[PDB]
Amino acid sequence: GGKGPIFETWVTEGNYYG
Numbered sequence: 001g002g003k004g005p006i007f008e009t010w011v012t013e014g015n016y017y018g
Contacts, residue, residue: 001011004018 001008001013001015002017004016006016006018008015008017
């Protein structure tokens with residue numbers, strides 16, 4: 001939920017955070 005290297009493993013929507 002944002003922008004970064006990690007796509008986040010919980011939102012399963014299509015975002016990042018790092």
